[PDB]
Amino acid sequence: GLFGAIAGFIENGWEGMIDGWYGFRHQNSEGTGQAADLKSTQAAIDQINGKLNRVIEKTNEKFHQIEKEFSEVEGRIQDLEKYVEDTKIDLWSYNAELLVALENQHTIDLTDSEMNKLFEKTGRQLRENAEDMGNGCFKIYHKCDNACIESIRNGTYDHDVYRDEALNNRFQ
Amino acid sequence: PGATLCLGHHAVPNGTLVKTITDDQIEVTNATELVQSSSTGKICNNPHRILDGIDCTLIDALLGDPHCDVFQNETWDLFVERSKAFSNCYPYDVPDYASLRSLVASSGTLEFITEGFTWTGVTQNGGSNACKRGPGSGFFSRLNWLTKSGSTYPVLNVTMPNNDNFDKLYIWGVHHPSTNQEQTSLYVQASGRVTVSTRRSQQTIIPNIGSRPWVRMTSARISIYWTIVKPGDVLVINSNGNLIAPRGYFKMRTGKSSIMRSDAPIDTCISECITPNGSIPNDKPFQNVNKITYGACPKYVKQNTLKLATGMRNVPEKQTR
Numbered sequence A: 001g002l003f004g005a006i007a008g009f010i011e012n013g014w015e016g017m018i019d020g021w022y023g024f025r026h027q028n029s030e031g032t033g034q035a036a037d038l039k040s041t042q043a044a045i046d047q048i049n050g051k052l053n054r055v056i057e058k059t060n061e062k063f064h065q066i067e068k069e070f071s072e073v074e075g076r077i078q079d080l081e082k083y084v085e086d087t088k089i090d091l092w093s094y095n096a097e098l099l100v101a102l103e104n105q106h107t108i109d110l111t112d113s114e115m116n117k118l119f120e121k122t123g124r125q126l127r128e129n130a131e132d133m134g135n136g137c138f139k140i141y142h143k144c145d146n147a148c149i150e151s152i153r154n155g156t157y158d159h160d161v162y163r164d165e166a167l168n169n170r171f172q
Numbered sequence B: 001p002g003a004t005l006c007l008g009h010h011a012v013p014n015g016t017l018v019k020t021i022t023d024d025q026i027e028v029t030n031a032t033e034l035v036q037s038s039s040t041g042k043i044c045n046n047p048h049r050i051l052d053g054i055d056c057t058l059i060d061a062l063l064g065d066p067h068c069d070v071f072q073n074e075t076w077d078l079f080v081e082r083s084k085a086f087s088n089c090y091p092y093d094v095p096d097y098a099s100l101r102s103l104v105a106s107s108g109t110l111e112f113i114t115e116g117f118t119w120t121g122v123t124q125n126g127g128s129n130a131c132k133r134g135p136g137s138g139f140f141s142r143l144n145w146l147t148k149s150g151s152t153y154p155v156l157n158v159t160m161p162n163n164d165n166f167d168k169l170y171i172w173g174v175h176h177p178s179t180n181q182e183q184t185s186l187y188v189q190a191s192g193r194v195t196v197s198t199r200r201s202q203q204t205i206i207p208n209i210g211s212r213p214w215v216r217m218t219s220a221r222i223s224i225y226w227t228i229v230k231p232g233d234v235l236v237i238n239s240n241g242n243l244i245a246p247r248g249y250f251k252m253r254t255g256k257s258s259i260m261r262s263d264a265p266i267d268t269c270i271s272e273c274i275t276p277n278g279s280i281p282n283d284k285p286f287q288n289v290n291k292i293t294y295g296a297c298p299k300y301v302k303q304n305t306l307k308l309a310t311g312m313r314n315v316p317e318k319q320t321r
């Protein structure tokens, strides 16, 4: 996609993540773990539901129309009837084809966008206490116990607390 | 002794292919079908009033072919003509069959109101072995075959004003005998004529004597014509022979009514959209079942499948095997 995160700098997805679309994996002194981010997940799902409901919204109800199958050869009037129906069907077929192409390109891009939004939000939260490894991971430069990790994930990480500790590990 | 925090997204074992602007096939975590490609095989009997023609075309029910008398005064949202339908009365043609069928189908009713036409000096209620009604000869229920009385067929001149506030549809005909002997036997005059007029329009038909192919005991034919009389207007029928007179008029309406050719059986279920293949659901915006439809239907398209991505790009772990 346009943001280069999904199928880009992030090598691949996580089949193990079953409770969310986007999320976090960590390694610290206490071990490894995983948690979904509910907000980025929901922003993607709300947008997808939004476009789905727009596409499937009923709009035509038709009753008496022209005949479209014919048992006799009649010539000019029947040629016009068939041409009209065939014109219509091609125009609608085209609309259908274009619609899904545009919708799907956009769906791929907005989901890529949400991955990137979460990555930039996380990076700004950490300030100077971590560095971008380039592969979708931050190397955090201080002791970050499980309480500290969950502080990052639920938006309560005070970077000032760990800054002096972290700044020293970075510039030596 | 630091810590790594990795951002990421989910993947699934079994993704789906979709089309985009740049790729004809690319894999995503899920997608949803936008083309309805299947049907039950059955026309649902709700919520639209479906009237099964059984052995009858709409036109035979209109005219009142005896095996179609059960359709008298019927109404419909959708009249369903079956391929097994057959005619079994006097052989006839309708110049502009398609238009009469269309305007009756659209009107949605066969409500007939009998009117007291006075046919002075002719015999009414003529019949034929071509059109059996019970054990003996008969004719279309809504038409009145006039023939000579004694040995005269006088000039018929009658009037029927429309003092109502709705359009009246009159169905009438002209008899084309097979021989001159039949013509003069039935109508005295060697050449009949039928003139049916309103204030604004007129139709005049000269009958044409000659053999057609034998159908149900006769080489003769009837030709069916129609005339709509508006509120305030007047019908005049003038003829010196060969008139197949109306007995009254059909009440015209406008609405949602139509007609469809189909052999799908009618079943007890609920479906807004009807096709000749049967009913289809309308939760999807497009359909590939049939270009002929009635009701709230998806739009017909040529594609049998179109997948709308409902998930991100699916990127699995790189395989070691």
Ligand SMILES: *[C@@H]1O[C@H](CO)[C@@H](O[C@@H]2O[C@H](CO)[C@@H](O[C@@H]3O[C@H](CO)[C@@H](O)[C@H](O)[C@@H]3O)[C@H](O)[C@H]2NC(C)=O)[C@H](O)[C@H]1NC(C)=O
Pocket: B157, B158, B159, B234, B236
């Ligand atoms: C065949 O029958 C029709 C229907 O009755 C006859 O039409 C009527 O013809 C008379 C005159 O022949 C018309 O009378 C005129 O009416 C106006 C006012 O409307 C009046 O001011 C005149 O003094 C005159 O009497 C009458 O309107 C007309 N009616 C209709 C409905 O058209 C027709 O004459 C008959 N013809 C034959 C040969 O039998």
Ligand SMILES: *[C@@H]1O[C@H](CO)[C@@H](O[C@@H]2O[C@H](CO)[C@@H](O)[C@H](O)[C@H]2NC(C)=O)[C@H](O)[C@H]1NC(C)=O
Pocket: A069, B037, B038, B039, B276, B277, B288, B289, B290
């Ligand atoms: C619905 O009915 C239509 C017409 O009865 C089917 O279309 C025909 O399908 C065959 C292939 O199976 C084609 O060769 C014909 O050209 C089609 N006929 C017409 C008149 O279009 C259609 O397949 C049916 N679809 C479903 C889902 O039942």
Ligand SMILES: *[C@@H]1O[C@H](CO)[C@@H](O)[C@H](O)[C@H]1NC(C)=O
Pocket: B030, B031, B032, B033, B310
């Ligand atoms: C994926 O889409 C299908 C419809 O195409 C739906 O029935 C299914 O429940 C969806 N699964 C998930 C996990 O969203």
Ligand SMILES: *[C@@H]1O[C@H](CO)[C@@H](O)[C@H](O)[C@H]1NC(C)=O
Pocket: B072, B073, B111, B112, B113
């Ligand atoms: C048809 O309707 C009219 C009045 O609406 C009625 O007089 C007539 O007898 C009806 N015929 C049948 C067969 O129901």
